[PDB]
């Protein structure tokens, strides 16, 4: 295990054993990211940052919830045919600070989150449940920042808290470390 992934394990509870998927209140959006590498990122300095248009959506809805309910955040990989973990939405958006960690460099903005579960769902768990808002399709097939309905979610949500999982993105952490070593090696190189 390599160090610095034990240290985030010490300092956190990842994948806690009593989760409240029965939400009361708050809610619930998909995030598609590009890369594995963002999601390391992501939770080695707990922020996140979609497009203009879903960090846009994501700071209205977060604003409107006013603290009264969670917004929770289901992580899948471009293309990975499976989710990776949940995150809570801990502010707002800053919309002008580059975060500066993303394999879309060019991206603008972050926003504060709080890794709960870092585990990998496959899709089959989870593809017969539709989204009454995505005009019934599978919320596997949904885009970045899809918001699923509060019912849909706690469905989502006990799946997701109660999948035993195999892997993870931590399995291989240390390929992201010598991943951000080299993209930091070559911006120095540059300079």
Same mark, same amino acid.
């Given at each position: 295990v390599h160090p610095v992934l034990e240290k985030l394990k010490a300092i956190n509870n990842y $994948?806690? /054993? *009593?989760? *409240?998927? $029965?939400? /009361?209140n708050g809610r619930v959006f998909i995030i598609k990211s590009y890369c594995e590498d963002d999601i390391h990122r992501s939770i080695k300095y707990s922020i996140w940052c979609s497009t203009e248009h879903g960090n846009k959506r994501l700071d209205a809805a977060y604003r409107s919830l006013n603290g009264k309910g969670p917004l929770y955040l289901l992580f899948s990989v471009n293309g990975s045919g499976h989710f990776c973990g949940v995150a809570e939405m801990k502010s707002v958006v800053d919309y002008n600070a580059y975060a500066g960690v993303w394999c879309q460099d060019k991206w603008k903005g972050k926003f504060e989150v709080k890794w709960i579960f870092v585990k990998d769902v496959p899709n089959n768990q989870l593809r017969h449940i539709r989204l009454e808002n995505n005009d019934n399709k599978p919320v596997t097939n949904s885009r970045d920042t899809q918001e699923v309905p509060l019912e849909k979610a706690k469905q989502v949500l006990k799946i997701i808290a109660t999948f035993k999982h195999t892997t993870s993105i931590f399995d291989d952490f240390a390929h992201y470390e010598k991943r951000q070593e080299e993209e930091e090696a070559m911006r120095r190189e540059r300079n």
């Open positions: $994948n806690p /054993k *009593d989760f *409240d998927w $029965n939400l /009361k």
